[PDB]
Amino acid sequence: SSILEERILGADTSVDLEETGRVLSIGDGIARVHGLRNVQAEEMVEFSSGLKGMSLNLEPDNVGVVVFGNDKLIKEGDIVKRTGAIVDVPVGEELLGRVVDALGNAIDGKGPIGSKARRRVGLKAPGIIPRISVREPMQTGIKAVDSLVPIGRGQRELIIGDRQTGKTSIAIDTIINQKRFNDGTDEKKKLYCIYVAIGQKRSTVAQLVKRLTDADAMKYTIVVSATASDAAPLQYLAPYSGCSMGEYFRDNGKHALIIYDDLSKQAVAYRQMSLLLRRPPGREAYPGDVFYLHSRLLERAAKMNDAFGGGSLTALPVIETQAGDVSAYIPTNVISITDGQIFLETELFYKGIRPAINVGLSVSRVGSAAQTRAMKQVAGTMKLELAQYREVAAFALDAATQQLLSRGVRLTELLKQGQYSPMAIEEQVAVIYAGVRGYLDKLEPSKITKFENAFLSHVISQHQALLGKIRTDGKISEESDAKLKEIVTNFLAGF
Template sequence: GRVVDALGNPIDGKGPIEYETRARVDVKAPGIIPRKSVHEPMSTGLKAIDAMIPIGRGQRELVIGDRQTGKTAIILDTFLNQKPLHEADDEKVKLYCVYVAVGQKRSTVAQFVKKLEDAGALKYSIVVAATASDPAPMQYIAPFAGCAMGEYFRDNGMHALIAYDDLTKQAVAYRQMSLLLRRPPGREAFPGDVFYLHSRLLERAAKLNDENGAGSLTALPVIETQANDVSAYIPTNVISITDGQIFLETSLFYQGIRPAVNVGLSVSRVGSSAQIKAMKQVAGTIKGELAQYREMAAFAQFGSDLDASTQRLLNRGARLTELLKQPQFSPLKTQEEVAVIFAGVSGFLDPLPLSKVRPFEDGLLRYLREKHPDILDRIWAEKQLSDELRGKLHEAISNFARSFA
C-alpha cells in the first residue's frame, strides 16, 4: 500500500517503512527445474482479453501500442479486478500487484495512485516510481527494484503481478547511460546489450513448482510504439522475449472500440492452458467468428447484394465487437464474463439493434446478480459448464431477453 522510489525509499509522505529483509535488485532468474508450466488464470476483468488472449499466472504478456491507446488503463483495470480475490481472504488465490512507473510525469503517477486508492486497491499494491525528473540510473534500476519486490511474493509461495510502464523509457535511460560511458552504440544508438537488459528482467517472471512453494510472478511489460511500428528495435526485442502480446491500436480507439485490442494481431502463447474450462467452452468460437467477420467486412464494402449467411455473419460479428467493448474502471468477474459471452455466442444479441447491445449486457448482469446469483456462483465453483448448468443459464438469459424486448 505504499509508493516508493527506485531504491525503496517512501515518496508518498506517509512516514518511513519498517522492513524485515533486504533483497538484491539484480538476481538471476529461476532455472528450468524449479519452474512449472503456467496453468492458473490471471483474470484481467476485461472481456476481450480474458476470452481471446487469456493470461496465466507466471506468464509474461506484453501490452504494446502507441501513446494514448489505453495501455495503462488495461493495467489499472487488471489491478482493480484483483479486489474480490483479496476479499475472499484465501492466500492461495490472492494476487499482489506491483506497478513500476518509469519516466512518466509525476502527475500521471499521482493520478494512478489516486485511482487505486479510491477503488480500495492500494492496500494490496506497491507502486515504484522513477519519474521523468529522476536521473537515468534511477529509471534504469526501477524495474529491477520492483521485480525484487514481486519476487518476494513469488519465492514465498504467493502470487504477484508486476507491470512495467514502460520499458521503452527504461531502454532510453539505459542508452543515455551507455553513451555517457562511451560504450559503442548499436541499432538506433541503443547499446548492444539492451536485449539482455530486458531478457534478464522478464525471465524473472515465472511459475514455480510445488517443491518451491508454487508461487508465481506474472509480468505485464508495456512498450510504446511510434506510429504502430512494431518492427522497431525495442518492440521486436520484447515481443520475442514475452509469451504473447496485447496489441492496441489508435484507429480502433478512435472508432470507440475500447479496450482498443486488435484481436487479429494479439496472441497469448501459453495462456490458453490457464483459461478456466467454462470460458474455453463459450469463447472457443468467438475468435474465429471475429476473424471471419473482419475478412467479410473488408469484402462487404465493395458489394451490396450479400446472401443471407454472409449477412448473418456480419450481424453477429458487429454484435460481438460491440459486446467486447467495456468502460474503464468496471472489470467483470470471470463468471460474469462467461455469462455475457455465452449470451453473445448463443445468438441472443442477433435480433437486437447495435445500440441496444450494451444496455442488454448491463441489464443481463443486473438480472443475474439479483435473480440468479446461484448460477454465477456455480460457474465459479465448477469452473465448467455442464449441460444442465448450460441449460439453466440459457433459460435465465431467454427469460431476461423476453422482458428486455
C-alpha cells in the same frame, strides 16, 4: 515540543571503521575517481554527497562512478565511502499497501515501509527446476481481453501501445481486478500483485494513486515509483527493482505478477547512459546488450513451481507501440523476449472504440492453459466466429455472410468495455454463451450494449445465486446451461 525531543532522543549514531574514495574526475554524473578499491562490484557504495552508487567500472588506475542522483549538488574530490556492498533492495512485502520510489522513497508520504529484510537485489534468473507449466488463471477483470487471451501465473508477456493508448487504462483495470482477487482468500486468488510506473509524471502517478485510494487496491498493491524525474540508472534499476520486489514474495510463495510501465522508457535511459559512457551503441542509440540488458529483468517471469515453493512471478512488458512501429529494434526485442505480447489497436480507439486491442495483431500463447474452461467452452467458437466475421469484415450479399456480419456486429458491440470495471470471468462466460447463443443477433448491435447492461443487471440481481451455481459449475452444467437459456429468454423479454 517534547515529542520533537523524543524523536531527537534515541537518535543513534554509532561509528564504524571505514575509509572512503576521494573523487578524482568529475563530470556528466560519472566519476573516474581513485581509492576505496576495497569496494566490490555490483556494490552500493556512497559518496560524500550522501548519494549511494552502484559499481560503474573499475579502471586499472581510476574508478568510474555509477549513481542515479544529481551531482550539480556534488563538487569534485569528494570522498566516496567504499561500502563494497552489492546493490541490494529491501526484502519482504513491506511495500504492500505502500507506495514507494524505485529505491523505497515514498514520495507519496505515507511514512516508510521499513522492510526488516534487505533483498540482495543482485538477483538472477529463475532456472529449470521451478520452470514447469503454469496453471493459475489470471484475474484480469478485462472482459474480452481475458476472454481473448487468458493468462497464467509466471508468464513472460508484453504489451505495446501509442500515446494515451489505454495501456495505462489497461493497467488500472488490471489493478481494479486485483481487489476482489486480493479479496479472494486463497493466495492464488489473493492478488498480492505488483505494479510500477516508468517515466510517468509524478502528478499523473499521484492521480493514479488517488484512484488506487479510491480503489482500496493497496491491499492488492505495492507501488515502486519511476517518474519522469527518474535518473537513467534509476529507470534502469527500476526493472531490477521490480524484479527483486517480485523475488521477495515469489520466494515467499506468492502467486502474483508485476506491472511495470513502460519498459520503453528506461530504453531512453540506457541509451543516454551508454551515450554518457561514450561507448558507441547502435541504432535506436541502442547498445547490443539492450536485449540482454532487458533480458536480465525479462527472464524473471517465473512460474515458480514447488521447486520454488509454488510462488508465481508473472511478467508482462510495457513498451509503447510508438506510432505502432512494430519495426522498432526495441519492439523487435520486445516481442522477441516475451512468451507473448499485448498488441493494442489504435483505429478502434481512434474510432473511439475503447477497448481497442489489436485483435488482428495481439497474441498470447497462454489461453485455456491457466484459464476458466467454462468461458472457454462458452466462447471458443465465439472467438472463431469473431475471426470469421473479420474475414467477413474483409469485404464491403450472402445472407450467410450477412449473418456472420450481424454476429460480428454484436461481437464488437459487446467485447469492449469502459475504464475501471473490475469483474470476474462470471459475466464473461455468461455473455459468452449469450452471444454464442446469438439469440440477440436480431437485437440492434447499437441496442446490444444497452440491453447488455440490462442483462448484466438482471443476472447480478436474480441469477446471482445461479451465478454462484455456475461458479460451482466448474464444467458446463447442462442444468446451468438450461438456466442460462431460460434467463436468456427472460432477459430477452426484457428487451
